[PDB]
Amino acid sequence: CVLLHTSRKYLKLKNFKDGFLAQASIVLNETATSLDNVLRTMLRRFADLLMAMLFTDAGAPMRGKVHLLSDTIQGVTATVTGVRYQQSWLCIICTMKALQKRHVCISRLVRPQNWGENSCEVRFVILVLAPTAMEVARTFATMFSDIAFRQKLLETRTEEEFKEALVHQRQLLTCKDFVPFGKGIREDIARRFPLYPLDFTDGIIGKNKAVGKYITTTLFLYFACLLPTIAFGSLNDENTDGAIDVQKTIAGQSIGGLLYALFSGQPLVILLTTAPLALYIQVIRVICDDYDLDFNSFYAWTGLWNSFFLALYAFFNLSLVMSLFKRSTEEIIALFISITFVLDAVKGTVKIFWKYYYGHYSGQATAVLSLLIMLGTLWLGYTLYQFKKSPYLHPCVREILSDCALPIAVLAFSLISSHGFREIEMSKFRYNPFAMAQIQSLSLRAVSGAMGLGFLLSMLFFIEQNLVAALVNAPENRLVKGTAYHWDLLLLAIINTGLSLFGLPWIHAAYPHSPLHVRALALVEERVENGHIYDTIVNVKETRLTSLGASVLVGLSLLLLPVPLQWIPKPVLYGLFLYIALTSLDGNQLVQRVALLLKEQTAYPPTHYIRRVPQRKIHYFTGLQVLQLLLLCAFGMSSLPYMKMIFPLIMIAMIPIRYILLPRIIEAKYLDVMDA
Amino acid sequence: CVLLHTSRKYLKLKNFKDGFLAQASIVLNETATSLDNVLRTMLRRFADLLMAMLFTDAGAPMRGKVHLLSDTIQGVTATVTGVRYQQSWLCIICTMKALQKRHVCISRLVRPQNWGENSCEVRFVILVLAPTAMEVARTFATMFSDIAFRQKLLETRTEEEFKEALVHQRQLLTCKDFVPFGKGIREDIARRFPLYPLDFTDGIIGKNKAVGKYITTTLFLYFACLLPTIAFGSLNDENTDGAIDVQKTIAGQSIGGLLYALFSGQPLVILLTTAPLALYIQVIRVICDDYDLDFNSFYAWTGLWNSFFLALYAFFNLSLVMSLFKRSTEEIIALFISITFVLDAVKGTVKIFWKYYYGHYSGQATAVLSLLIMLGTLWLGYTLYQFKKSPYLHPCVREILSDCALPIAVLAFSLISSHGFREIEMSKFRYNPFAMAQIQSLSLRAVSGAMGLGFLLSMLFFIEQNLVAALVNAPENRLVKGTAYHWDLLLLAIINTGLSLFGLPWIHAAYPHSPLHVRALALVEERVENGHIYDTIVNVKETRLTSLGASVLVGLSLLLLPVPLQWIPKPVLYGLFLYIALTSLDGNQLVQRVALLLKEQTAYPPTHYIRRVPQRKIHYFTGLQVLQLLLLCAFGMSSLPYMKMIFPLIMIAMIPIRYILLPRIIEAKYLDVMDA
């Protein structure tokens, strides 16, 4: 072995408040795969024994030794996760006494190449030869450290355009809030009305064409909204004894998505039915059965009261308090939703076994095949989804696999269970081939009960919709257009009134699908941390065409319901539920901290928040979060409808708990470190 | 973000051909988890505002910035895989003008910690403060760069012992080969006879006690030899129409393992039946059925001829030519073995479906449950095995998971399929509760045929045994005791004669279990490359107690045949075959190159052999290897016994092909880079 001396030092960003800009040599579309070839081409561009000195193996270039660059500059940032390097660019420096004049070469690679440990996705290489080099390297790093400038340089097609862009960039670098009634809605409408034509024509016309990306994301959204829509329709049919069918769920989802895409601010939010909504509909069905009330009328009245409360919240600008919402409560809610998905799948398979395996109406074969198909669908979907994080696959391959993991698994296992195992008939969701509910035919006592239930549902809707909207409107997503929280809530209430009046299932912003929609509609910079791909969004196109097309396709899918879309057996839908439950915990810090018990704290990155905070306080915070999650499960997953209807109240209550009690029992600094 | 300047430079290993050795301060068993605490303790040991200067965030220690060490020295090596850093230690340097005298502090951490990207397993931190620092840091790095010296320092218990060890280490650092008949056997016997008592007492007595490690590895070996032994016994019973039972396979494996452990050199090699051996036994059964020859007599004669040829090879010292063996041929053979395992599992499940699902004697339920159990066993075993590579799990946790993955999966799914699904009876391996074969009652023509078949089997045995022995005797394993190839081959021939005379299935060195046995019986230094744990063996204990105990336990397991060990259904054994097939390709470079078509070449480390070699030549080599593998599969996996009996010949032929033809069509430099 050979000893290596690594020296790290800061460099102040150049303060612009040039000759080498024009004298720089630009290489575009470099197809070389190795560092040696790229550097040889870059050096030849100047006009060789000069490439050898660039690395540590200076003096013994023939013998096989460690081949590492000597002087490099990169962008670095500090975060709770650790030290994140800017791996999209690299600046190599070489001070050669033989040379007489400074030389600068900027090379843009066709594909991101792995130039080092923290430079796994380098696309720009800035080689600076000097006869100092420090000043030129610093100024070029300062110019290249901008996230948008790198994308602008990527968009350039010619060397002259590259130099002009560089010159242009250098020159350029040189309480009581709720008192106003309806202020938030008016502000959101004013913000998002002028930008509306652009939403339709962002990528259709202009310098950048997004037709292919728009089509691909439209297909993604259509599939990822239809398949969960079918699963939720089947679940509701099982829960409501056929009151809400799969056809009703599909129609409601299509209408709601179309209305939201057409007439909402922040169109990137996707409306879909959720597991807690199914649980609450089950609560309504149980109450109606107990009190002999018509399901349709009671459901319509509950939806009407929920929409009324949501409109009251929107008009009074309550959404602002959602700024106090922290990540811990969000992750607790997400884990509860995943647990509800898992329990729905388990209940479905248990019912299948009870009806078929135990003969409580060849049933054993059907039950075993159902279990096998559900587990296999889950496994295949999870594997195809996790292939997205592989840093060695082509970007196209690992974005198609992410895009078409669940659809591929569903199709493959539907074929397996309907053609490979056609001799074993199994369960399929009901389909009997939209009348307004008789709201007037209901007692006043039932109206008051619906009022209370709608209040609880409105709290649930407020929390969920604002959570997903905040996720979509995160600062790291780089959304130029303004936010629309109150107008979005009002439109959600309106469309929910419309859906409830016709008995269609309720819908709100979908947590798993909205960030996925944003990512599919965004340009990202690949980052490799611990051997996994992480995406840094640079530009989101922010168009309504994708959501509108997805909604229209989902609506048109009603014609494929009888003959197609029914060969998908119920166990495939349960596997879809399981896949959603597992894949909704990708960035869950609560799950990470829970697993930390089985992991090694010292194993985490030196500057990781886990290693920074004492393990005792981390465990205390995890225990408090787990206690909150257990209490949420206890109320919101019991057999008692009267106590299953209360879980929105405790969802509201956790926010005051996190805001008040936890800082009193846990130090504020540690909570700030963990949450951020 | 803040620009970072990384400077890399060589440092010549100190040439010893001291005061600071004695003046150094030693800290032992440091339980601190963060770098700040560890260094604060080290600085306090001298006797604070000095810890801040050690990192790049000098001048702004309060504001949250990137917290990286400034000057660090570590051990680095170059390999075809890439640049491998010595992560087991770090040297931190600080030149402070305030200080008046040099200071050195050596801290040993209780557990390995992550101190950076390439310092993921740091156990020794050497901090050098200077008022130069370069000389002291270089000499300490040179002393610590030794792999065995780090283990010796770990073994020390007191500061005085640590200093004495440091001082002692510093002082210390200051053709025609086959003509002799039987020379190899005599040399091996002379080499490995004096060391024989030590083999029994390596860890039992002395400074280091290995009782716990010996017990754990004995349990691992017992389970990993019994379960595949049962699977192979069932496969042979299916193939040979009950001629070779599971009881016979267990007895033969136990006797052979005991004999090999007792009276062989290099006892770390594990003898077990293999898939090609099962295929060849099937060939023998088919030939006997075709020619109406007694299976036992023909099998015994074939084994006798195979042993005679193996003894001839051992006495004439042919094993030496195995040095010409390359990694490409080894990996082709391993992939062929895995494919044979997969086809055996597929044939078993196809037969189960044909008998039960199609009723060609509730069968559909049994077939579907068989498929589900096999797939689930494969999945669980693979997951528990792959958890071994997680860099965040505790070393004990991942070591146990690797040790008890297959046994845990087998037990869990046997319980599931025998208790959870007890209503669905399914296939179980035959067991009817050891007579010498009537060799004298066989025709001369059958004797000549058995001679030819035994010649082919002897070539197969030579290749397989020498391959596994070379894997066990790899230089990187650090085996102090000498190698024994010819004596091992002679003993293998003797025990094979003994086994064949009684009709027991043949056995030779097991490729998947011998390296695993070595690893379980070895101390390793953890390395994290691309987020995966890689082990560097420092010391292998090299004892026969583990293999002897495993063989004795396997033999004693015959008493657990009737009531235990039969609830394991055949699909569990097929899942075991699949698990072995998938887990035998961990380091397979042929599989890596085949998958490279779907991967990105530029995403590999800069110094990886994949990027160094042009992709065209990599693809040509992969295509040639795949063609050889396809020919091997075609000959050794067809329905014709006369052509299924020839695959050992082409296994032999592939070595001349690799040695002669490939260098002619592929450049020698690229082949050397890829193979090494």
Residue numbers in the entry:
A (entry chain A), B (entry chain B): 105 to 121, 131 to 160, 173 to 256, 264 to 306, 336 to 522, 569 to 640, 645 to 887
Which text from the study accompanies this structure?
BTR1 (SLC4A11) is a NH3 stimulated H+ (OH-) transporter belonging to the SLC4 family. Dysfunction of BTR1 leads to diseases such as congenital hereditary endothelial dystrophy (CHED) and Fuchs endothelial corneal dystrophy (FECD). BTR1 shares a similar membrane topology with other SLC4 family members, with its substrate binding sites located in the central cavity between the gate and core domains. The TMD contains a core domain (comprising TMs 1–4 and 8–11) and a gate domain (comprising TMs 5–7 and 12–14), resembling the arrangement of UraA25.
Loss of function of BTR1 caused by the R125H mutation has been widely reported. Given that the binding of PIP2 is pH sensitive and histidine is less positively charged than arginine under physiological pH conditions, we presume that the pathogenesis of R125H mutation can be attributed to the charge alteration of the L site which in turn adversely affects the binding of PIP2, ultimately leading to the impaired transport activity of BTR1. To further explore how PIP2 participates in the complete substrate transport process of BTR1 and prove the connection between PIP2 and pH sensing, we attempted to solve the structures of BTR1 with the R125H mutation or wild-type BTR1 prepared under acidic pH, which may both disrupt the interaction between BTR1 and PIP2, and succeed in achieving resolutions of 2.96 Å and 2.94 Å, respectively. Intriguingly, two structures are nearly indistinguishable in conformation (RMSD = 0.250 Å), and both lack the densities of PIP2. Compared with the structures of BTR1 in the outward-facing state, the distinct features of the non-PIP2 binding BTR1 structures involve that the NTD has undergone a significant twist, as well as an apparent conformational change has taken place in the TMD. Analysis of the TMDs using HOLE2 shows that the substrate binding sites of BTR1 in these two states are accessible from the intracellular side, suggesting their inward-facing conformation. The structural alignment of the TMDs of BTR1OF/APO state and BTR1IF/R125H state by the gate domains shows that, during the conformation transition process from the outward-facing state to the inward-facing state, the gate domains remain relatively unchanged (RMSD = 1.678 Å), but an obvious displacement has occurred in the core domains (RMSD = 3.784 Å). The core domain of BTR1OF/APO state needs to go through a 12.38° rotation and a 7.4 Å shift towards the gate domain to reach the position of core domain of BTR1IF/R125H state. In comparison with the alteration of the TMD caused by the disruption of the interaction between PIP2 and BTR1 during the state transition process, the conformation of the NTD changes even more significantly. The NTD has undergone a 175.9 ° deflection and a 24.9 Å position shift from BTR1OF/APO state to BTR1IF/R125H state conformation.
